[PDB]
Amino acid sequence: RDIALGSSVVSIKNQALGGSLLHSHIQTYPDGSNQQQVTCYGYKDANNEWFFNRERGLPSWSENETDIEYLKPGTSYRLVHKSTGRNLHTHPVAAPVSKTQWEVSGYGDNVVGDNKDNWVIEIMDQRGDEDPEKLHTLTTSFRIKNLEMGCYLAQTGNSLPEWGFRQQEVVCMKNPFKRDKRTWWNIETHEN
């Protein structure tokens, strides 16, 4: 099974030891940008659900489209938090705990946003043999790179303070080692 843009609702699990699910919620950062927090969380929840949308400026996905569009490594996408409708976002703002890395937030919606809402998938490993060019549920390991920034989405290992419910810090890491697993993700749950 393959992941498509719009109609695949996914959870995204980090591959480091201690890795957990990409998460967001209405709470905002007290410092930094004051934007919506993004974290990793360890338990099943609706706030772990994401879907991929088109790059900024293209028409947003709807249920009335002509074809299924499979996610392609190399192509720009917007990673949308299903519960809040905010886009995964980064910027040159110091992360809350890992202060030499960049803060990751939830920003905008379909109309409001900007070029830092665009991310690119890089396939690092495929276990078993379906299309090597496609994202598969729980066998494809991938990095999520911010197109503008050039940085990679990562669960650092640090916990947030109680303003972030002591969830795991997520940052955009500058210049990591390609095999750092903090920066490695897979699709865990996939609902159509």
PDB file of all heavy atoms in Angstrom, residues 95-116:
ATOM      1  N   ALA A  95      15.117  26.890  18.295  1.00  0.00           N
ATOM      2  CA  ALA A  95      14.214  25.904  18.918  1.00  0.00           C
ATOM      3  C   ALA A  95      14.212  26.101  20.432  1.00  0.00           C
ATOM      4  O   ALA A  95      15.135  26.734  21.018  1.00  0.00           O
ATOM      5  CB  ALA A  95      14.676  24.503  18.606  1.00  0.00           C
ATOM      6  N   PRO A  96      13.173  25.631  21.093  1.00  0.00           N
ATOM      7  CA  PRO A  96      13.039  25.887  22.528  1.00  0.00           C
ATOM      8  C   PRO A  96      14.107  25.285  23.428  1.00  0.00           C
ATOM      9  O   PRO A  96      14.475  25.923  24.353  1.00  0.00           O
ATOM     10  CB  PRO A  96      11.640  25.398  22.839  1.00  0.00           C
ATOM     11  CG  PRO A  96      11.351  24.374  21.817  1.00  0.00           C
ATOM     12  CD  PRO A  96      12.037  24.866  20.569  1.00  0.00           C
ATOM     13  N   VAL A  97      14.496  24.063  23.194  1.00  0.00           N
ATOM     14  CA  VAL A  97      15.481  23.406  24.017  1.00  0.00           C
ATOM     15  C   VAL A  97      16.799  23.262  23.287  1.00  0.00           C
ATOM     16  O   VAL A  97      17.807  23.586  23.832  1.00  0.00           O
ATOM     17  CB  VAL A  97      14.992  22.038  24.509  1.00  0.00           C
ATOM     18  CG1 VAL A  97      15.958  21.432  25.534  1.00  0.00           C
ATOM     19  CG2 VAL A  97      13.621  22.204  25.145  1.00  0.00           C
ATOM     20  N   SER A  98      16.778  22.779  22.043  1.00  0.00           N
ATOM     21  CA  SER A  98      18.000  22.647  21.239  1.00  0.00           C
ATOM     22  C   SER A  98      18.217  23.981  20.518  1.00  0.00           C
ATOM     23  O   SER A  98      17.885  24.163  19.391  1.00  0.00           O
ATOM     24  CB  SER A  98      17.848  21.528  20.227  1.00  0.00           C
ATOM     25  OG  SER A  98      17.563  20.340  20.810  1.00  0.00           O
ATOM     26  N   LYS A  99      18.925  24.871  21.179  1.00  0.00           N
ATOM     27  CA  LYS A  99      18.958  26.229  20.744  1.00  0.00           C
ATOM     28  C   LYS A  99      19.809  26.497  19.518  1.00  0.00           C
ATOM     29  O   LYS A  99      19.655  27.577  18.933  1.00  0.00           O
ATOM     30  CB  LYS A  99      19.394  27.193  21.900  1.00  0.00           C
ATOM     31  CG  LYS A  99      18.691  27.047  23.223  1.00  0.00           C
ATOM     32  CD  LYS A  99      17.248  27.368  23.223  1.00  0.00           C
ATOM     33  CE  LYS A  99      16.896  28.753  22.705  1.00  0.00           C
ATOM     34  NZ  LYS A  99      15.437  29.015  22.508  1.00  0.00           N
ATOM     35  N   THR A 100      20.627  25.558  19.050  1.00  0.00           N
ATOM     36  CA  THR A 100      21.358  25.669  17.816  1.00  0.00           C
ATOM     37  C   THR A 100      20.597  25.094  16.605  1.00  0.00           C
ATOM     38  O   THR A 100      21.125  25.114  15.525  1.00  0.00           O
ATOM     39  CB  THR A 100      22.701  24.920  17.897  1.00  0.00           C
ATOM     40  OG1 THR A 100      22.516  23.490  17.925  1.00  0.00           O
ATOM     41  CG2 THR A 100      23.464  25.386  19.137  1.00  0.00           C
ATOM     42  N   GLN A 101      19.371  24.666  16.833  1.00  0.00           N
ATOM     43  CA  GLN A 101      18.508  24.159  15.735  1.00  0.00           C
ATOM     44  C   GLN A 101      17.302  25.079  15.584  1.00  0.00           C
ATOM     45  O   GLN A 101      17.172  26.048  16.337  1.00  0.00           O
ATOM     46  CB  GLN A 101      18.075  22.725  16.032  1.00  0.00           C
ATOM     47  CG  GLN A 101      19.209  21.776  16.363  1.00  0.00           C
ATOM     48  CD  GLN A 101      20.143  21.544  15.191  1.00  0.00           C
ATOM     49  OE1 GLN A 101      20.048  22.031  14.137  1.00  0.00           O
ATOM     50  NE2 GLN A 101      21.109  20.673  15.435  1.00  0.00           N
ATOM     51  N   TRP A 102      16.430  24.820  14.619  1.00  0.00           N
ATOM     52  CA  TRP A 102      15.315  25.696  14.314  1.00  0.00           C
ATOM     53  C   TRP A 102      14.008  25.184  14.881  1.00  0.00           C
ATOM     54  O   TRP A 102      13.685  23.969  14.832  1.00  0.00           O
ATOM     55  CB  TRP A 102      15.132  25.906  12.815  1.00  0.00           C
ATOM     56  CG  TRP A 102      16.280  26.502  12.074  1.00  0.00           C
ATOM     57  CD1 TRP A 102      16.760  26.044  10.898  1.00  0.00           C
ATOM     58  CD2 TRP A 102      17.027  27.705  12.372  1.00  0.00           C
ATOM     59  NE1 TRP A 102      17.723  26.890  10.422  1.00  0.00           N
ATOM     60  CE2 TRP A 102      17.922  27.906  11.288  1.00  0.00           C
ATOM     61  CE3 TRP A 102      17.032  28.621  13.415  1.00  0.00           C
ATOM     62  CZ2 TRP A 102      18.814  28.982  11.225  1.00  0.00           C
ATOM     63  CZ3 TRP A 102      17.887  29.748  13.318  1.00  0.00           C
ATOM     64  CH2 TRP A 102      18.794  29.849  12.237  1.00  0.00           C
ATOM     65  N   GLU A 103      13.220  26.071  15.444  1.00  0.00           N
ATOM     66  CA  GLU A 103      11.880  25.810  15.862  1.00  0.00           C
ATOM     67  C   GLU A 103      11.021  25.295  14.726  1.00  0.00           C
ATOM     68  O   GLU A 103      11.067  25.849  13.641  1.00  0.00           O
ATOM     69  CB  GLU A 103      11.320  27.124  16.428  1.00  0.00           C
ATOM     70  CG  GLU A 103      10.005  26.983  17.124  1.00  0.00           C
ATOM     71  CD  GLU A 103       9.241  28.233  17.225  1.00  0.00           C
ATOM     72  OE1 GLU A 103       8.551  28.573  16.244  1.00  0.00           O
ATOM     73  OE2 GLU A 103       9.307  28.958  18.251  1.00  0.00           O
ATOM     74  N   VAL A 104      10.139  24.340  15.043  1.00  0.00           N
ATOM     75  CA  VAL A 104       9.130  23.834  14.110  1.00  0.00           C
ATOM     76  C   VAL A 104       7.768  24.176  14.717  1.00  0.00           C
ATOM     77  O   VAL A 104       7.509  23.882  15.888  1.00  0.00           O
ATOM     78  CB  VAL A 104       9.310  22.323  13.877  1.00  0.00           C
ATOM     79  CG1 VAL A 104       8.150  21.723  13.123  1.00  0.00           C
ATOM     80  CG2 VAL A 104      10.625  22.093  13.160  1.00  0.00           C
ATOM     81  N   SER A 105       6.896  24.704  13.929  1.00  0.00           N
ATOM     82  CA  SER A 105       5.570  25.103  14.320  1.00  0.00           C
ATOM     83  C   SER A 105       4.482  24.655  13.390  1.00  0.00           C
ATOM     84  O   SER A 105       4.725  24.073  12.318  1.00  0.00           O
ATOM     85  CB  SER A 105       5.544  26.620  14.449  1.00  0.00           C
ATOM     86  OG  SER A 105       5.580  27.180  13.135  1.00  0.00           O
ATOM     87  N   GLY A 106       3.243  24.899  13.798  1.00  0.00           N
ATOM     88  CA  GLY A 106       2.040  24.792  12.962  1.00  0.00           C
ATOM     89  C   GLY A 106       1.645  26.179  12.526  1.00  0.00           C
ATOM     90  O   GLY A 106       1.529  27.054  13.409  1.00  0.00           O
ATOM     91  N   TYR A 107       1.500  26.445  11.296  1.00  0.00           N
ATOM     92  CA  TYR A 107       1.331  27.823  10.725  1.00  0.00           C
ATOM     93  C   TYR A 107       0.274  27.794   9.660  1.00  0.00           C
ATOM     94  O   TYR A 107       0.135  26.886   8.853  1.00  0.00           O
ATOM     95  CB  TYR A 107       2.650  28.250  10.110  1.00  0.00           C
ATOM     96  CG  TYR A 107       2.684  29.690   9.619  1.00  0.00           C
ATOM     97  CD1 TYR A 107       2.722  30.705  10.509  1.00  0.00           C
ATOM     98  CD2 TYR A 107       2.613  29.993   8.267  1.00  0.00           C
ATOM     99  CE1 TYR A 107       2.818  32.030  10.102  1.00  0.00           C
ATOM    100  CE2 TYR A 107       2.625  31.323   7.816  1.00  0.00           C
ATOM    101  CZ  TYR A 107       2.722  32.318   8.746  1.00  0.00           C
ATOM    102  OH  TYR A 107       2.777  33.669   8.308  1.00  0.00           O
ATOM    103  N   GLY A 108      -0.527  28.852   9.624  1.00  0.00           N
ATOM    104  CA  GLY A 108      -1.457  29.062   8.534  1.00  0.00           C
ATOM    105  C   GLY A 108      -2.567  28.070   8.354  1.00  0.00           C
ATOM    106  O   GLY A 108      -2.953  27.365   9.308  1.00  0.00           O
ATOM    107  N   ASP A 109      -3.018  27.984   7.135  1.00  0.00           N
ATOM    108  CA  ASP A 109      -4.170  27.110   6.735  1.00  0.00           C
ATOM    109  C   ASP A 109      -4.037  26.876   5.218  1.00  0.00           C
ATOM    110  O   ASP A 109      -3.008  26.917   4.679  1.00  0.00           O
ATOM    111  CB  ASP A 109      -5.487  27.722   7.238  1.00  0.00           C
ATOM    112  CG  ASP A 109      -5.771  29.128   6.687  1.00  0.00           C
ATOM    113  OD1 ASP A 109      -5.290  29.520   5.642  1.00  0.00           O
ATOM    114  OD2 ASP A 109      -6.480  29.889   7.342  1.00  0.00           O
ATOM    115  N   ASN A 110      -5.128  26.673   4.416  1.00  0.00           N
ATOM    116  CA  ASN A 110      -4.954  26.734   2.901  1.00  0.00           C
ATOM    117  C   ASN A 110      -4.666  28.072   2.215  1.00  0.00           C
ATOM    118  O   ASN A 110      -3.955  28.147   1.198  1.00  0.00           O
ATOM    119  CB  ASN A 110      -6.106  26.090   2.152  1.00  0.00           C
ATOM    120  CG  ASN A 110      -6.098  24.571   2.261  1.00  0.00           C
ATOM    121  OD1 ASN A 110      -5.051  23.950   2.360  1.00  0.00           O
ATOM    122  ND2 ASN A 110      -7.264  23.970   2.211  1.00  0.00           N
ATOM    123  N   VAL A 111      -5.158  29.132   2.779  1.00  0.00           N
ATOM    124  CA  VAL A 111      -4.985  30.442   2.159  1.00  0.00           C
ATOM    125  C   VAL A 111      -3.743  31.104   2.677  1.00  0.00           C
ATOM    126  O   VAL A 111      -2.928  31.547   1.917  1.00  0.00           O
ATOM    127  CB  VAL A 111      -6.290  31.309   2.307  1.00  0.00           C
ATOM    128  CG1 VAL A 111      -7.332  30.856   1.305  1.00  0.00           C
ATOM    129  CG2 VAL A 111      -6.924  31.218   3.682  1.00  0.00           C
ATOM    130  N   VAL A 112      -3.564  31.110   3.988  1.00  0.00           N
ATOM    131  CA  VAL A 112      -2.509  31.835   4.626  1.00  0.00           C
ATOM    132  C   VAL A 112      -1.433  30.785   4.781  1.00  0.00           C
ATOM    133  O   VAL A 112      -1.625  29.703   5.313  1.00  0.00           O
ATOM    134  CB  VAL A 112      -2.883  32.422   6.004  1.00  0.00           C
ATOM    135  CG1 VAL A 112      -1.636  32.769   6.857  1.00  0.00           C
ATOM    136  CG2 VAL A 112      -3.752  33.638   5.841  1.00  0.00           C
ATOM    137  N   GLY A 113      -0.279  31.138   4.334  1.00  0.00           N
ATOM    138  CA  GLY A 113       0.928  30.412   4.658  1.00  0.00           C
ATOM    139  C   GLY A 113       1.989  30.960   3.819  1.00  0.00           C
ATOM    140  O   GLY A 113       1.786  32.031   3.194  1.00  0.00           O
ATOM    141  N   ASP A 114       3.136  30.321   3.776  1.00  0.00           N
ATOM    142  CA  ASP A 114       4.224  30.744   2.982  1.00  0.00           C
ATOM    143  C   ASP A 114       5.135  29.710   2.526  1.00  0.00           C
ATOM    144  O   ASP A 114       4.824  28.549   2.752  1.00  0.00           O
ATOM    145  CB  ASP A 114       4.941  31.925   3.617  1.00  0.00           C
ATOM    146  CG  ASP A 114       5.683  31.533   4.863  1.00  0.00           C
ATOM    147  OD1 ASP A 114       6.163  30.366   4.978  1.00  0.00           O
ATOM    148  OD2 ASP A 114       5.841  32.371   5.732  1.00  0.00           O
ATOM    149  N   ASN A 115       6.233  30.014   1.840  1.00  0.00           N
ATOM    150  CA  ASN A 115       7.047  29.056   1.221  1.00  0.00           C
ATOM    151  C   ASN A 115       7.715  28.122   2.233  1.00  0.00           C
ATOM    152  O   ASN A 115       8.147  27.031   1.808  1.00  0.00           O
ATOM    153  CB  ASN A 115       8.098  29.771   0.437  1.00  0.00           C
ATOM    154  CG  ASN A 115       8.908  28.881  -0.380  1.00  0.00           C
ATOM    155  OD1 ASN A 115       8.404  28.047  -1.153  1.00  0.00           O
ATOM    156  ND2 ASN A 115      10.188  28.936  -0.167  1.00  0.00           N
ATOM    157  N   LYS A 116       7.846  28.535   3.499  1.00  0.00           N
ATOM    158  CA  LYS A 116       8.429  27.622   4.506  1.00  0.00           C
ATOM    159  C   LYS A 116       7.474  26.551   4.938  1.00  0.00           C
ATOM    160  O   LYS A 116       7.855  25.671   5.767  1.00  0.00           O
ATOM    161  CB  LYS A 116       8.896  28.477   5.702  1.00  0.00           C
ATOM    162  CG  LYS A 116      10.153  29.305   5.326  1.00  0.00           C
ATOM    163  CD  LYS A 116      10.497  30.368   6.363  1.00  0.00           C
ATOM    164  CE  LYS A 116      10.046  31.803   5.959  1.00  0.00           C
ATOM    165  NZ  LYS A 116      11.218  32.520   5.368  1.00  0.00           N
TER     166      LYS A 116
END
